[PDB]
Design a protein around this nucleic acid. Structure first.
Lengths: 68, 68
DNA sequence: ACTTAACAAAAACC
DNA sequence: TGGTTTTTGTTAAG
DNA sequence: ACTTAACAAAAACC
DNA sequence: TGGTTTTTGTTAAG
């Protein structure tokens, strides 16, 4: 069978890191090939656009206030 | 030749969306296959772990205060 | 610190 | 007991 | 609103 | 003028 997966957000940073391991690589590969290795700006923008795609403008604005 | 790319963070949300278009798909595909289609939690965690990997704990804490 | 991979063991499933 | 996968932490390396 | 793809045109490069 | 790619916005569809 295998142990059931807990929600990503409930996991330790260690276990969270283990689950995204493969996507972290794909993101790295993309950022390198297309955005001059700027993972932060890429993940920041993915997250921002993911928020605004969901109409969470208030949260997106607050994150945009934090990042400057 | 082709027009030089501006920095991702200087672009309009429209143009930003156009550049990440392909990574947005890979992220979608991953979230669906591995995280029950939870793009937000995935991008949130990628960004958080990207911040803490860079020792930007203060910013990561503030984003973690915003998201609850 | 952070990262990484390896070695472990416990946990939760069959 | 056996299996598995997930979760954690430690351990040994950058 | 958001999304998407299409159609446009201007911009910045050759 | 031609080419290209990028940037924007609009347009027509969910």
């Amino acid at each position: 069978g295998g142990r059931p997966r807990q929600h990503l957000l409930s996991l330790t940073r260690r276990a969270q890191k283990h689950r995204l391991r493969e996507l972290k690589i794909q993101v790295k590969e993309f950022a390198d090939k297309e955005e001059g290795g700027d993972v932060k700006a890429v993940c920041l923008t993915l997250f921002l656009l993911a928020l605004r795609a969901r109409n969470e403008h208030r949260q997106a604005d607050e994150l945009e206030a934090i990042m400057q």
